[PDB]
Design a protein around this ligand. Structure first.
Ligand SMILES: CC(C)CN(C[C@@H](O)[C@H](Cc1ccccc1)NC(=O)O[C@H]1CO[C@H]2OCC[C@H]21)S(=O)(=O)c1ccc2c(c1)CC[C@@H]2O
Lengths: 99, 99
């Protein structure tokens, strides 16, 4: 579909058998999601943006479905105020910016 | 243009007569630029990001050209890690997400 940007580009995603709401975020290199106790191994990471850094858990090869488009890649889990789908997964669902 | 997301969506902007590089950021409500000199009045403002809140200088009705497309709108100036173009200006240049 086509998503205008008058409001935040929020979509439903399916991850870890749970449905959540996330932003389609061209400004995020990678995907960052709210605290969720996913199974499997992970490695610690620090990610920075406006206001500073947060500590997150990096999970690899995670399956996510975004508006019915399946993707698989890195998901960073931590105390983020918003869930963002970043370019690592947006490329996989074929998402472009257009103007 | 149609912009894929294998790389950061970086573009050249013109603001205050100076060229700069900025990131097209659909996950940003607002446009935030790194410290710079801009003419005119400004009001102290706070904005929150992934890591917390920062103090910015808010400039209203600022001419800014983004990849050859003109906008006039609010530009926040402050200690952001990256020059980001947010939805307040992406809508002005007609930017949509498409997949
Ligand atoms: C600033 C960008 C360059 C990087 N961010 C992504 C932007 O889209 C953030 C997303 C966001 C939205 C809502 C709340 C919190 C965050 N928007 C943002 O800060 O918006 C400002 C300005 O407008 C306001 O409206 C929203 C908030 C205000 S990030 O979240 O910091 C990030 C993500 C992944 C990753 C990193 C860093 C590092 C490595 C990893 O890839």
């Amino acid at each position: 579909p086509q998503i205008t940007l008058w409001k935040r580009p929020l979509v439903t995603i399916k991850i870890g058998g749970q449905l959540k709401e996330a932003l389609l975020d061209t400004g995020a290199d990678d995907t960052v999601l709210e605290e969720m106790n996913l199974p499997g191994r992970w490695k610690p990471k620090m990610i920075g943006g406006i206001g500073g850094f947060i500590k997150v858990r990096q999970y690899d090869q995670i399956l996510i479905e975004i508006c019915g488009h399946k993707a698989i890649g890195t998901v960073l889990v931590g105390p983020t105020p918003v869930n963002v789908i970043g370019r690592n997964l947006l490329t996989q669902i074929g998402c472009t910016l257009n103007f």
